[PDB]
Each structure stands twice: as C-alpha cells, then as structure tokens.
C-alpha cells in the first residue's frame, strides 16, 4: 500500500502543474 | 535404437585388445560417441568420447596414451583400441550416444546405453 | 550495496528494498562469480542489462 | 577438471517418503547436471537432464533443481523399483565426469 518516493507581496510564483 | 557390444574377454596384463558397439536404429554419423566403464562392484568412470566426424577425440585421465577411440561410418560401428592393459582397467565397458531430449538442446546430454561388455585383465588360466 | 550488505535479516523477516530511478548494471553482477548459484527464471541474464 | 561429489553416499527410507540427493561441482557449470537411474548388472537410465527437465517415460516423481554450483534429485514419493543407486554427470566441459554414486536402500 506504499510506493517510491523522490527526495531533492513582492514576488510572485507561477506553477503549472 | 540399438548398440551392440563385443570384444570382451579374459586378456592378460600389458597386451591390447578392440571393443566394437555396433550401431542402429538411428543416423549414427551425426552424434558423438562416448565409452564408459564400470569396474566391479564400483561407480561409473567417463572413459573416451570421439566427435562424429572421428576428428576430434578426448579421453580420461587413466587412459590416456594407451586407449584410442575410432569410427566407421560406413558400418555404423563403435570402436576402441585399448593397448598397454593393466588390473585396474577391468570394467564392464558401456558405449553411449551424445543425445538431447528436447529444445533444451544447449544441455547437450547422454542417453541411451548398450547392453556393456565385461572386460578382465588377468594372468589367470 | 544490497549484496555487500554487512547483516542480512532473519529468512522470517525479509527486507525488501525498493530500486527505482537508477541506471543497473546487471552485466557486472553477471560477469561477477562468486556467486555460488546465478538462477534465473524471468529473463535470461544475459538480456537483463 | 570439474569434480561432483554427492551427499549421501547412501541413504535408507521407505516406500512413500520424500528423498533428496545432493551433487555439487568444484567450479560452476549453470545448468548441465545430467541424473541417471542404474540398477545392479544393467545400465543406467537416464532421468533428469539439464538438471532440471524430466526425461520422456520417468515418472514424474522424479524432479531436479539447481543451477551453478548446487543441486538437488528429489523423488517426491518412493516405491520399491526406486531403490538404486544414482549419478550425478556434468557436461559443460571435458572431460566429462560422473560424481561418486547414491544408493538408495530400503529402510
Ligand atoms: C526468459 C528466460 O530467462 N528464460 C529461461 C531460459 O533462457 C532458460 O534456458 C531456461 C532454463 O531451462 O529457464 C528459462
Ligand atoms: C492495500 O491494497 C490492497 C489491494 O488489494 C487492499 O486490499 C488493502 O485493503 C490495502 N490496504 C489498506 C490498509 O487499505
């Protein structure tokens, strides 16, 4: 029941996801 | 299929002697052929094994020098020459067929058996 | 890592470990022999690299 | 030379039970064992071949396992024609050899 896994105002942050 | 053994005996130690296995019931010219040996009362031992074209021919530890192994195609016939005998050389002498029983053909195997031939090396009367 | 691991658990308890995003270099565990036995049933070694 | 020595040299049981013959190789030779059947005053028969594929016409009791190094005849359920004394034979390379004998006695 568990997977992998990946490890690693005055501005404005755009994401698409 | 079928191998018939001859040649055995009584021989007398340091002398030679021929075992033939003829061969039917298959293409014999295209299989490897092997000699093995069974001393009284004892285990196998691998004796001499020839190509099926007679060029190559390998045998074991104890023989080399002394036995040759030979071929003829014509009459599909098995033959060694053992020379040199000596008392731990009496073994019933079985002469065998490469084989391999199916697809699984890079296992290449051992198969059918003759009947065996007893071999004595003796000084007796 | 996995084969030089210092202790293997108990055959009760078998860890299993996870790989992914890793390139894996079958060939070297091949061409490597002190493994006693090398089965292999699903894919043929040689076409595991 | 590759040598194969087999465990037991003997063993005793009775008909029904479940055997396991051993044979291994100085050197690794993946999957070339040859088992063989022989009975006293004939020649041996030939049962597991690839030391993991059953021959036309053996029961298919009889089974073989293994790769490498180790190996392993089972014979899941015995009975009184199974007695007898049993080969282990490597092929990948010559000269060819045959490991020490099994016997399998009644018990
Ligand atoms: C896909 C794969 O690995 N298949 C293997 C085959 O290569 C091998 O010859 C056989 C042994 O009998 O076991 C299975
Ligand atoms: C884990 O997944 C399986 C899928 O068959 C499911 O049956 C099981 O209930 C899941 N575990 C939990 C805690 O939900």
């Known amino acids: 029941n568990c997977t992998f896994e990946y490890v690693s105002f005055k501005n404005l942050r755009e994401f698409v996801f | 299929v079928q191998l018939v053994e001859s040649g055995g005996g009584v021989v007398q130690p340091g002398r030679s002697l021929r075992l033939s296995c003829a061969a039917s019931?298959?293409?014999?010219?295209?299989?490897?052929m092997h000699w093995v040996r069974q001393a009284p009362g004892k285990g196998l031992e691998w004796v001499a094994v020839?190509?099926?074209?007679?060029?190559?021919?390998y045998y074991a530890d104890s023989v080399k020098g002394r036995f040759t192994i030979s071929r003829d195609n014509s009459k599909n016939t098995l033959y060694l020459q053992m020379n040199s005998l000596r008392a731990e050389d009496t073994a019933v002498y079985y002469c065998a067929k490469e084989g391999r029983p199916s697809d699984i053909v890079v296992v290449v195997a051992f198969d059918y058996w003759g009947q065996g031939t007893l071999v004595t090396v003796s000084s007796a009367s | 890592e996995v084969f030089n691991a210092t202790r293997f658990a108990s055959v009760y308890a078998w860890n299993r470990k996870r790989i992914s995003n890793c390139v894996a270099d079958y060939s070297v565990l091949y061409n490597s022999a002190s493994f006693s036995t090398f089965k292999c049933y699903g894919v043929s070694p040689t076409k595991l690299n | 030379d590759i040598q194969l020595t087999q465990s037991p040299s003997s063993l005793s049981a009775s008909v029904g039970d479940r055997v396991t013959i051993t044979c291994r190789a100085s050197q690794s030779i993946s999957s070339y064992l040859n088992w063989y059947q022989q009975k006293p005053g004939k020649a041996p028969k030939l049962l597991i071949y690839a030391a993991s594929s059953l021959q036309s016409g053996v029961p298919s009791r009889f089974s073989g396992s293994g790769s490498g190094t180790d190996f392993t005849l089972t014979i899941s359920s015995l009975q009184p024609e199974d007695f007898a004394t049993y080969y282990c034979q490597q092929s990948y390379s010559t000269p060819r050899t045959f490991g020490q004998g099994t016997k399998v006695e009644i018990k």
């Open positions: 020839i190509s099926y074209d007679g060029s190559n021919k």
């Open positions: 019931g298959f293409t014999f010219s295209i299989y490897g």
